Amino acid sequence: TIPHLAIDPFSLDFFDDPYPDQQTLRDAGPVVYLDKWNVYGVARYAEVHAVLNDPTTFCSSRGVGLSDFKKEKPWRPPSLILEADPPAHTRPRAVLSKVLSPATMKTIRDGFAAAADAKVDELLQRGCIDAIADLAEAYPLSVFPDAMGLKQEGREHLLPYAGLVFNAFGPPNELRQTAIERSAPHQAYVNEQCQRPNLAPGGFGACIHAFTDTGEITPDEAPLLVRSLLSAGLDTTVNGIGAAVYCLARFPGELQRLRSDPTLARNAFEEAVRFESPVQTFFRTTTREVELGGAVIGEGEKVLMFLGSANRDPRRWSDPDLYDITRKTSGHVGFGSGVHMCVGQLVARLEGEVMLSALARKVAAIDIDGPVKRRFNNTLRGLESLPVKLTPA
Ligand code: HEM
Numbered sequence: 586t587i588p589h590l591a592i593d594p595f596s597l598d599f600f601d602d603p604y605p606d607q608q609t610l611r612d613a614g615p616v617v618y619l620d621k622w623n624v625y626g627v628a629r630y631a632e633v634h635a636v637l638n639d640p641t642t643f644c645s646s647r648g649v650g651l652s653d654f655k656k657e658k659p660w661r662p663p664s665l666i667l668e669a670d671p672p673a674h675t676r677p678r679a680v681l682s683k684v685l686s687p688a689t690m691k692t693i694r695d696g697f698a699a700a701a702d703a704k705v706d707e708l709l710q711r712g713c714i715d716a717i718a719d720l721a722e723a724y725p726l727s728v729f730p731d732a733m734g735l736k737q738e739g740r741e742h743l744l745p746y747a748g749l750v751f752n753a754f755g756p757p758n759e760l761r762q763t764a765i766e767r768s769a770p771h772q773a774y775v776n777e778q779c780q781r782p783n784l785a786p787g788g789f790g791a792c793i794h795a796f797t798d799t800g801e802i803t804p805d806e807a808p809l810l811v812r813s814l815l816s817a818g819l820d821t822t823v824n825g826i827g828a829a830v831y832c833l834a835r836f837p838g839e840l841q842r843l844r845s846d847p848t849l850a851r852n853a854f855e856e857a858v859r860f861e862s863p864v865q866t867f868f869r870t871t872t873r874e875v876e877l878g879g880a881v882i883g884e885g886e887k888v889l890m891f892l893g894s895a896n897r898d899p900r901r902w903s904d905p906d907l908y909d910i911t912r913k914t915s916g917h918v919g920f921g922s923g924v925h926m927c928v929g930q931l932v933a934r935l936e937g938e939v940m941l942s943a944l945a946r947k948v949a950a951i952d953i954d955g956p957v958k959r960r961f962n963n964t965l966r967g968l969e970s971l972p973v974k975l976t977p978a
């Protein structure tokens with residue numbers, strides 16, 4: 586009843602060009618079985634959205650990676666929000682929701698926007714830059730660690746730790762084993778900065794500890810929630826911003842439209858998240874026998890969702906393979922959907938908007954002038970290097 590495919594969604598050939606195999610997965614049926622890893626797969630928008638919005642049947646407490654927390658030990662203490670189900674998820678979710686709230690965005694926007702304009706002005710003085718190292722990575726590093734209230738010492742551990750986290754959502758392949766092997770120094774740094782004394786006042790981390798008074802979280806829960814922001818809020822935005830610049834470099838017509846109306850900056854970034862969703866796949870675990878698209882899935886089974894595929898499903902999107910900054914992107918799953926939908930999505934959109942805004946107002950052309958190198962990760966999609974020439978407006 587369920588088609589069995591040998592496609593390995595965690596192979597380098599899949600990372601290099603996943604779109605053909607993703608059509609193969611979508612067109613094989615609403616639910617496939619991946620013999621490579623003994624997990625169910627759903628690649629269409631309909632089933633991806635259904636799974637995300639049924640948290641009771643497709644839980645997150647048994648891990649959102651391949652590993653089933655009920656069968657193996659998590660490589661680190663489980664996240665109190667990402668790897669938890671309602672009701673345990675509810676109160677930690679509400680705290681991070683308030684820490685990263687609309688009101689909070691107003692306190693940091695000016696500094697985030699100024700930092701983005703300064704970076705673009707700096708990059709235009711150099712002309713030929715690497716849109717990843719010098720922009721996609723440089724800008725988020727200049728605003729997010731400071732917004733967290735982190736000290737200057739040891740920030741080099743942040744990106745290695747984030748890449749570890751997302752590699753660990755994948756199967757026990759080379760990418761995962763190597764990341765966990767080299768991980769000890771990054772865990773020590775991250776865990777230490779999660780302690781209240783090490784977080785500068787007024788920052789995201791200090792605000793998390795400040796919510797230990799309300800009865801929503803206890804003091805011993807705050808460090809892990811700071812750990813959540815250091816795990817989820819840097820590497821994702823880096824790939825998101827890189828994807829946006831990548832799209833603008835490949836679709837010059839859309840850059841010209843963005844220039845003519847910089848107020849499209851926010852939707853241009855949202856479209857980039859749909860087009861090259863930074864998080865390509867993650868898992869749920871069934872808590873019971875469930876019928877999904879005509880297929881019966883047993884209890885305790887891992888279900889792999891193809892978020893990027895769902896964002897290019899022609900059953901849902903018109904011209905899904907076109908980057909369109911005026912597209913109505915509402916409904917894309919680049920940030921997830923349901924109770925776990927990225928609680929830091931307002932920070933991500935703020936960084937992306939103000940950066941694309943700076944580009945829209947200051948840059949006339951973005952031309953690739955060097956070898957493009959991809960960055961391989963079990964669950965993240967992004968570039969290693971994007972050599973571009975920036976022409977001032
Ligand atoms: C382009 C940027 C980003 C993308 C594409 C992204 C993607 C996602 C996705 C798809 C989920 C859902 C995971 C699931 O349902 O299992 C998620 C959850 C989450 N994200 Fe993001 N994210 C981004 C930026 C950020 C930022 C900036 C932060 C913090 C500052 C953050 C923190 C979190 C947290 C804490 C969760 C867990 C929410 C929960 O489990 O209730 N993310 N993210």
Ligand SMILES: O=C(O)c1ccc(Oc2ccccc2)cc1
Nearest residue numbers: 664666667812813816817864867
């Ligand atoms: O440590 C945490 O709580 C945490 C939360 C969210 C993260 O981003 C993801 C993870 C899986 C799938 C999509 C986004 C990563 C870590």
Ligand SMILES: [Cl-]
Nearest residue numbers: 661772775776
């Ligand atoms: Cl850790």
